[PDB]
Amino acid sequence: IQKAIEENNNFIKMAKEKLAQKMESNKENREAHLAAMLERLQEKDKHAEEVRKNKELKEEA
Amino acid sequence: REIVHIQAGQCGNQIGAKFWEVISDEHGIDPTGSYHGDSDLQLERINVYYNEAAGNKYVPRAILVDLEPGTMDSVRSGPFGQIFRPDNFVFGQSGAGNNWAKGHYTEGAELVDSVLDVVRKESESCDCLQGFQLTHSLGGGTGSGMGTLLISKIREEYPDRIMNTFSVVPSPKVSDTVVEPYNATLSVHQLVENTDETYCIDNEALYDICFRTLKLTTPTYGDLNHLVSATMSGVTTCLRFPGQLNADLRKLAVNMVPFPRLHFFMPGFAPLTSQYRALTVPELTQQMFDAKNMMAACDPRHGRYLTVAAVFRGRMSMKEVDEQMLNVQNKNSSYFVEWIPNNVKTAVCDIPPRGLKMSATFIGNSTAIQELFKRISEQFTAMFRRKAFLHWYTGEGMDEMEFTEAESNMNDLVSEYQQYQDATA
Ligand SMILES: Nc1nc2c(ncn2[C@@H]2O[C@H](COP(=O)(O)OP(=O)(O)O)[C@@H](O)[C@H]2O)c(=O)[nH]1
Ligand SMILES: COc1cccc(-c2cc(NCc3ccc4[nH]ccc4c3)nc(N)n2)c1
Ligand SMILES: [Ca+2]
Ligand SMILES: [Ca+2]
Ligand SMILES: [Mg+2]
C-alpha cells in the first residue's frame, strides 16, 4: 500500500512539474517572438528617421 | 461447539444467503427467527449455527462482508433478510472491481479491522468456539482478495481454531471478467497455508450439471446456487443434527486430511434436482460416485482417492447402504489408495432435506482435484507470459514476483498431488 501511494504521488509530481516546465518555456518562446517583431519594426523607424534626415542635408545646398 | 460463519463478496453472500434459507427451513426457523417445528431433534444442535436471543428468537452466527453495498442490500431485502443481526452487516462503498489487490491490500485493508471486531463479539459469546467457515468466490476481488485477508487475520487471533471454506472456482464458461485466473491463483496460495478444509465448488461443473443433466438451456446463478446450498446443507448435516456421531470440525479434519497442503475436496450430491419417483439405495450410491454428480470439474478415474466420506439422509436400510457402499468399493477399488486402510466413511442422518425422501452428499479427497489447478494454471500462464492485464494490479502496489511466486506454489501443489497419485504400497 505504501508503494501504491508512492506511485500515485510521483505520477502527480512528474505531471505537475512537466506541465509547469512546458508553460514556462512556451511563455519565453512567444515573448521572444514578439520582442523580435517589435525590435524589427523599431529598427525600421530608425531607417525612417535616417531617410528624413538625409533629405534635410541636401535641401541645404 | 459453536461455528462462526462469514460470507464475503457477491458470490459469497448469495450462496451464503441460500444456505441460511435452507438450513433455517430444516431447523424449523421462520424468516422472523421464531421456531415453528414439529420435532425436538431440530433444536438439539441449533446452537451450532444460531444464537438464542431475547424472545426465544434464533439469530444466525453469521457475518456479512462486502466492499460495495449492492448485494448486501439485496440480502437484507430477500426472503430471509430480516433474520441476520443488523450489526453483523459490514460493508464499504467503493468496491473491489474484481481486483484481488484491491480486496487484499488497499480497499479491503481499510475495512478488515471493522470486520474482525464483529468476529470478536461473536466469538466472545461462544461457550466453546469450534471454528470458522467462509463462503466466497476466488475469481472476484472482495471474496477472493479480502476473503483471504480475513483468513490470514483470523489465524492470527485464533491460531488454534479450525478454518474451513466453501470456495467457488472460476471457469470461462461462467465468467464475469478475464482476470479471474489471476485472482484465483493468488487466492489458492493463501488457502494452501491457512485453511483446514476447502470444498472446491467449480462453476464449470455446476453449469454442465444444470445444462447437460438437468436439461436447463439457460442456467442462471440462482440455478447454480440451488446446487451449492443443497451440498453445503448435506456437508453440515453431520454437525447440525444429532446422530450417534460425535463430529467436531477438528476430528473431521483429522480423519480426512492426511497431509496439511492436500485439503481440497470434491463435493458431490445425489439425486440432482431443479420428480417424485422414490430413488433406490443402489441408485444413490452409484450416482454419488459418478463424475456427473461432482461439483469439481475433475474425473475421479484420472486420479485416486485419499479419503472419502458419504452422507446419507432419510429413512433407509442402514444395512443396504453398507452392502452397496461395500459393493462400489470393488467397482473402483483401483482408485483408492491402499496405504490408508478403511479410508471410506459413511454417515446417516434420519432427517431428509426439503422435498426429498432420500439424498446423499459426497465428500472426496482425491488427487484428481489436481486437474482443476492445472486448468487455472494454464489460463494464468497464457496471460502472464505476456504480462496482460497486469497494470490493474501493479497500479495497486503489487510486484510481478508476487505473481511468479503464486504461480510456482500452485505448480508445486500440482506436483505434490502427482507424487501421491503414483505412490503405491
Ligand atoms: N455460483 C455463483 N458464482 C458467482 C456468482 N456471482 C459471481 N460468481 C463467480 O464469481 C466470479 C465473479 O466474482 P464476484 O462475485 O464479482 O466477486 P466479488 O467482487 O468479491 O463479489 C465469477 O467468475 C463467477 O464465476 C453467483 O451468484 N453464483
Ligand atoms: C466446512 O465446514 C464443515 C461444517 C460441517 C461439517 C463439515 C465436514 C463434514 C464431513 N462429512 C461427514 C463426516 C465425514 C467423515 C467422518 N468420519 C467420522 C465421522 C464423519 C463424518 N467431513 C468433513 N471433513 N467436514 C465441514
Ligand atoms: Ca480509501
Ligand atoms: Ca481496531
Ligand atoms: Mg461481481
CA of B32 to the centre of ligand 2 (A): 29
Architecture of domain B369-425: Orthogonal Bundle (1.10)
Q: Quick check: B133 and B5 in contact, CB under 8 A?
A: yes
Name the closest residue on chain A to residue B396, using Cα atoms.
Answer: A4
* B395/A2 touch (CB, cutoff 8 Å), yes or no: no
Cα–Cα distance measured from residue B311 to residue B305, given in angstroms and rounded to the nearest whole number:
17
Closest among B322, B206, B196 to B256, alpha carbons compared: B196
Please list the residue range(s) of chain B that carry CATH number 1.10.287.600.
369-425
Mark B185-219 as b/e (b = at least 16 C-beta within 10 Å): bbbbbbbbebbbbbbbbbbbbbbbbbeeeeeeeeb
Residues of chain B positioned with their CB less than 8 A from the CB of A2? 397
Cα–Cα distance measured from residue B295 to residue B246, given in angstroms and rounded to the nearest whole number:
27
Helix (H) or strand (E) holding A59: none
Question: How far B405 CA lies from chain A's nearest CA (Å)?
Answer: 19
Indicate the fold that domain B259-368 takes in CATH.
Answer: 60s Ribosomal Protein L30; Chain: A; (3.30.1330)
Nearest atom in ligand 1 to the alpha carbon of residue B142 is 20
Cα–Cα distance measured from residue B263 to residue B257, given in angstroms and rounded to the nearest whole number:
6
Name the closest residue on chain A to residue B109, using Cα atoms.
Answer: A1
Cα–Cα distance measured from residue B128 to residue A51, given in angstroms and rounded to the nearest whole number:
111
Closest among B134, B155, B198 to B373, alpha carbons compared: B198
* B105/A7 touch (CB, cutoff 8 Å), yes or no: no
CA of B274 to the centre of ligand 5 (A): 24
* A1/B106 touch (CB, cutoff 8 Å), yes or no: yes
Cα–Cα distance measured from residue B370 to residue B233, given in angstroms and rounded to the nearest whole number:
25
CA of B175 to the centre of ligand 1 (A): 8
CATH number of B1-258: 2.60.40.1220, 3.40.50.720, 3.40.50.1440, 3.20.20.150?
3.40.50.1440
Please tell me if residue A7 touches chain B, with a CB cutoff of 8 Å: yes
Nearest atom in ligand 2 to the alpha carbon of residue B236 is 5
Binding-site entries of B: 10, 68, 137, 141-143, 203, 225
Question: How far A3 CA lies from chain B's nearest CA (Å)?
Answer: 5
DSSP label of A1: -
Most ligand 1 atoms within 8 A of CB, residue of B6, B75, B137 to mutate: B137
Please tell me if residue A2 touches chain B, with a CB cutoff of 8 Å: yes
Measured torsion, CA atoms of residues B53, B56, B59, B61, in degrees rounded to the nearest 10: 70
Please list the residue range(s) of chain B that carry CATH number 3.30.1330.20.
259-368
Please list the residue range(s) of chain B that carry CATH number 3.40.50.1440.
1-258
Ligand number nearest CA of B66 is: 1
Elucidation method: X-ray
Question: How far A17 CA lies from chain B's nearest CA (Å)?
Answer: 21
Q: Is B163 in the pocket of ligand 2 (CB under 6 A)?
A: no
**Integer CA distances (angstroms), B1 to B4, B25, B49, B119, B127, in order:** 10, 21, 9, 16, 7
State the residue for C-alpha cell 478488515.
Answer: B112
Ligand number nearest CA of A4 is: 3
Residues with CB under 6 A from ligand 1: B 9-11, 14, 96, 98, 137, 139-143, 168, 170, 174-176, 180, 203, 221, 224-225
Q: Quick check: B304 and B290 in contact, CB under 8 A?
A: no
Residues of chain A positioned with their CB less than 8 A from the CB of B397? 1-4, 7
